[model samples]
Target: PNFSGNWKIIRSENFEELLKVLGVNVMLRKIAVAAASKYAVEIKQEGDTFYIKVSTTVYTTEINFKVGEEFEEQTVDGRPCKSLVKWESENKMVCEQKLLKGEGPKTSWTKELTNDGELILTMTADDVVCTQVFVRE
Candidate 1:
């Protein structure tokens, strides 16, 4: 599948504010901002199943889901949510995440591989939008 590869974060846009909007504490947000460049993600797929692992100096997150199936997810900041993912195309995947906590905005994330082969992840929550671009390792 298009997402089956190792990708490393190269740069980000609005991620700092995105973290703040996501309710991450100041200390953790600082660490996440400082170590943003150290982020790496590995994605693997088998039939309709997708496994995604994201790693950084501060914390790591792993998720497994099937296309079009809703599943439970815990954010790196410990917030729980329900998430569903489906492919928009061969090189594009769209995900919807609904926070299980009170008064939280439902969010969406889109993953796409650029023409130059860069992996781009775009996340949105309410009016906040953040983008992170990655390169194959």
Candidate 2:
């Protein structure tokens, strides 16, 4: 599956709970959830490597990784973590991240592109799960 495009988030669910589980500050969480903003995800794939750029009202970040490889990444809160990505199915890619310090909960995101051209992003932190649906502009 070609996960390459500029995808706009049209709807979301339980994102606030996910942020809380990740230990985000209350102010930031409210700001993120209450603000009127447009969230975007740009994905590009070069050969076997994947580049994913996420843009939110509060922050923007870009990360790249290859399947079946472990790499370092910084969270939106600037926490360092190790990430591993894998292909779960023909149209689904799952990436897991573990904090580099302490026994904090691990996080994972599964991006599945459907045949109807919708992209479903499922973000998980501990037991918290957030779902976001996106479509190409």
Candidate 3:
């Protein structure tokens, strides 16, 4: 199945690498992994706007944006920041995230429609990215 519907992070592949890129220590990463089950994402869309809510036992995050509209993006990993993101080339999405002192990460998150009628979500940050696919339930 491709990841497009309401999905839970049952487990993640290369999560250690993701944590490394996010500058999370090994001990913290381990704790986070154990606590990851409490996190979930519910994504919904109306017209061109997307509402994505990511929640965990510790915190919750949500974003509302239009597909082609460039707006400030909330920084991930607790870094106070902002940036712009817009859809690029159909299912492929791009984000220019600005962090401390104007430093930013050009990232992209893509959702591709497969022949089997599923969605494949691919998200990239820094030089590392991961893909998870799912089906709508």
Candidate 4:
């Protein structure tokens, strides 16, 4: 579970529906459902601290923290959330965001690596799930 590599986005499933459930803004909302959404994710692990960067044509989301620490994060869709990311296990990284500022819904993302080596990022919001996958290049 080193997860320290440059990952390329594979594909996303049910993303458009999940975005609507999460109340995505129209400003950044026009990309996903139109043809395709592109992304490049980079992850770095420095002993206890972790750095994860998610990038696309619209914006980039960065997660910089250690597990079990409470921190505030600005999401890729341009919103603020008080989120805590945890290592569910050696292969699973989960982030749960609560008390998000200004009309944002409760949402979360779970990342797990399968034995097949595909990194799976699952977005959970309002009872909907969007599955985004990544693979080392």
Regions of candidate 4 where Cα sits further than 4 Å from its true position = 25-30, 34-36
**Alpha-carbon error at 65 in model 1, in Å?**
0.7
User: Please, what's the RMSD in Å of model 2?
Assistant: 1.9
Best by TM-score: 2
Compared with the true structure, what per-residue lDDT tens digits does model 4 show for residues 7-58?
8888888887777776776655566655335678899988658898877777
Q: How far does residue 99 in candidate 4 sit from its true spot (Å)?
A: 3.0
Candidate 2, residues 1-137, lDDT tens digits: the string is 88899999888888888888878899998887764147899999875598989887776788888999998887544689898988888889888888898666668888899999999999888898889899998
lDDT of the candidates, in the order given: 0.83, 0.83, 0.61, 0.77
Work out the TM-score per prediction.
0.88, 0.89, 0.70, 0.84
Write candidate 3's Cα lDDT for 55-120 as tens digits.
Answer: 778878887777656665554455655545565655555656556455545444555656775555
Worst 10 residues of 3 by lDDT: 1-10
> Would you give me the overall lDDT of model 4?
0.77
Question: Once model 2 is optimally superposed onto the true structure by TM-score, how far is the C-alpha of residue 82 displaced, in angstroms?
Answer: 0.4
- Global lDDT of model 3: 0.61
Pick the winner on TM-score between candidates 2 and 3.
2
lDDT of 1 by residue, 46-136 (tens): 8778899988886778999998999998643457888899899887889888778765655788889878989999888779888999999
TM-score, candidate 2, is 0.89
